[PDB]
Amino acid sequence: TLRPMFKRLLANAECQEGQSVCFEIRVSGIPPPTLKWEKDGQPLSLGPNIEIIHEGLDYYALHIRDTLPEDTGYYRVTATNTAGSTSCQAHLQVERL
Amino acid sequence: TLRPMFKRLLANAECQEGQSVCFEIRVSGIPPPTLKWEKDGQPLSLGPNIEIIHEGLDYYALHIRDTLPEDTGYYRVTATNTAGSTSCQAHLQVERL
Amino acid sequence: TLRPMFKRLLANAECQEGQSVCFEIRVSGIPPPTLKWEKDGQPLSLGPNIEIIHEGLDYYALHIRDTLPEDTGYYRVTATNTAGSTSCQAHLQVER
Amino acid sequence: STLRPMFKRLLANAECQEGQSVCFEIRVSGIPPPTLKWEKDGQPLSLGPNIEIIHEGLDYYALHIRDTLPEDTGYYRVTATNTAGSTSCQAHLQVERLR
């Protein structure tokens, strides 16, 4: 039994509107923690252009394609299991033109 | 609060070695269920070419690129929340050249 | 100048309907040759769920997603430059 | 029986952060369908391991540059040619340093 711990935290990013952007984390824990994603403190809605990818043992990626100005904001991830919780956030800046 | 429930089950799949294969499910639930994937009864090991994608509201896909014969087997997914659990499975046959 | 040559030829393929399939080739030549693709002797119908990919190391790929039974058939690629031309083909079988 | 190539959607200036991907998208027509040459700053484009050109339908082409480096900054040009003539357009890519 091991509390969830980030091995790789979210990092701030910027992209141009219409382009794609990727955020990435690695989070470990026994049992494998479940994740909750938020934007500006509200539950993240994936919609048509956002996807969450799970690879490897602890690797998760948040991918946005066809980014829009509205996608600008603070993205938070929270990992939880029976032993504890841990959370981090980063900012996405979608630039105009 | 409602028990998790597949709106689209895993379906049996087949591909040629070196090609890609995709399993797709759709599971709803309030609260949104957490998923657990298994291969032949053991916890699924996401290798280098295996990824799990979450899209939309309840869309989940298991993607395997560049399949190898080792990927042959029974894949199971369990969706759990505070109201209960649901599970389904299907078979993947990677055919050699 | 140099005649186009297939460093990797098309190989026969099979896929289940609704899944994806990829045909890969490697073509060299100076000048870099232009490619023309056919299916069953007629120009390849470039529509949804079909894409032609070009990447480094002379790599070219024909990718088809969400295959339908109509996608079964013989796919041919012809490479041509000023020094000549070369062609090869392979079969795709869509299965249920 | 011929028709000079014409851009229906042109390359657009782009910007991305080092390490992210950037995409350029065009639509070009013409009879017979034109062949394309891609250039970076007047030189033929070398795709390396990180660039792929995707052709969909008859007119759509996308230039995907992944794992961008600041040295990728420059002017990218595409030229479409058939037996009836040629047409060309270019855009600028700025790969901003992570710092």
Residue numbers in the entry:
A (entry chain A), B (entry chain D): 8 to 104
C (entry chain C): 8 to 103
D (entry chain B): 7 to 105
Per the authors:
The second segment in the pairwise analysis of spatial deviations ranges from the A’B loop to the DE loop. This region features several significant individual M-band domain deviations for M1 (BC loop), M3 (C’D loop, DE loop), and M7 (DE loop), indicating potential M-band domain signature motifs (discussed in more detail below). In our analysis of titin M-band domains, the C’D loops of M3 and M10 are flagged for being most diverse. In four of the six structures (M1, M4, M7, M10), D73 (M1), also invariant in all M-band sequences, forms an additional salt bridge with a conserved lysine/arginine (K52 in M1), located at the CD loop that connects two β-strands from the two opposite β-sheets. The conserved lysine/arginine position in the M3 domain is replaced by an asparagine (N52 in M3, K52 in M1), and hence no interaction with the equivalent aspartate (D74 in M3, D73 in M1) is found. As N52 in M3 is close to an M3 structural motif that significantly deviates from the other structures, it is plausible that the loss of this specific interaction is of functional relevance and part of a specific M3 signature. By contrast, the three cysteines of the M3 domain (C18, C25, C91, equivalent to G17, K24, S90 in M1), which are located in different β-strands A’, B, and G, are all at least partially surface exposed. As expected, we found one free cysteine equivalent for domains M4 and M10, and almost three free cysteine equivalents for M3. Unlike our findings for M4 and M10, size exclusion chromatography of the M3 domain under non-reducing conditions revealed a mixture of different higher molecular weight species. We attribute this to possible combinatorial linkages through all three exposed cysteine residues under the given experimental conditions. In the corresponding SDS-PAGE analysis, higher molecular weight species were only faintly detectable.
Titin has a molecular weight of more than 3 MDa in its longest isoform and is over 1.5 μm in length, spanning half of a sarcomeric unit from the peripheral Z-disk to the central M-band. Taking titin kinase as the N-terminal boundary of the titin M-band segment, there are another ten Ig domains towards the far C-terminus of titin, referred to as M1 to M10, encoded by at least six exons 358–363, or Mex1 to Mex6, on the respective TTN gene. To achieve this goal, we have solved the crystal structures of five titin M-band domains: M1, M3, M4, M7, and M10. In addition to the ABDE/A’CC’FG β-sheet sandwich core, all M-band domain structures comprise two characteristic tip regions, which we refer to as “N-tip” and “C-tip” due to their proximity to the N-termini and C-termini of the respective domains.
